[PDB]
Amino acid sequence: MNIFEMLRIDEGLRLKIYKDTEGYYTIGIGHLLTKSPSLNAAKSELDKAIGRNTNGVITKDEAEKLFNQDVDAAVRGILRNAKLKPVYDSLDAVRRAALINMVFQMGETGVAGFTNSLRMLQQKRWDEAAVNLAKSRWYNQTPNRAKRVITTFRTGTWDAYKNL
Ligand SMILES: [Cl-]
């Protein structure tokens, strides 16, 4: 198990424009297109991202290309952010993937707002971090995904993603 397989479990794969859990236009493996309510705006973003006239459908290879770019960007976002980088550097490899998962879902700014949870992670108070992370809109809106990520921070294993 690695970060690509993990996010593929959490995000799924769809080759046509769809709305995500928040109602936003999305394609591929959780690639957000736009927060605008206009499908035309979303189709224009898609064509710009892919570089051809797609008419709202992409291939699996195109979806995997956007996915590689998005994972790369999440990592680079962590390492550039002064609040996230010291956390990431303090973590083992499994828990690093859990942090990347959160940044992929909610962005660098969103995760950098979990101030108290990040401090607990850095101190390696895993049970206390797990409790604090669950006191969040994130946990209440997407509880099955949040549980899996939180379990990964608590245990430092992939057990939440096996049998899936
Ligand atoms: Cl969920």
Q: Which residues of 108-144 are buried (b: 16+ CB within 10 A; e: fewer)?
A: beebbebeebbebbeeeeeebbbebbeeeebeeebee
39 vs 78: CA distance, rounded Å: 31
* SS3 label, residue 33: strand
Q: What is the resolution of this structure in A?
A: 2.0
2 vs 5: CA distance, rounded Å: 6
Total number of residues shown for the chain: 164
- Give the CATH class of 3-161: mainly alpha
Please give the structure tokens belonging to residue 43.
Answer: 């189709």
Q: What angle do CA 86, 76, 132 make, to 5 degrees?
A: 45
How far is the centre of ligand 1, averaged over its atoms, from the C-alpha of 49 (Å)? 27
Looking at the annotation, which residues are catalytic? Answer: 11, 20
113 vs 103: CA distance, rounded Å: 11
How far is the centre of ligand 1, averaged over its atoms, from the C-alpha of 53 (Å)? 33
Method: X-ray
Tell me the residues surrounding ligand 1 (ion) with CB < 5 Å.
142, 144-145
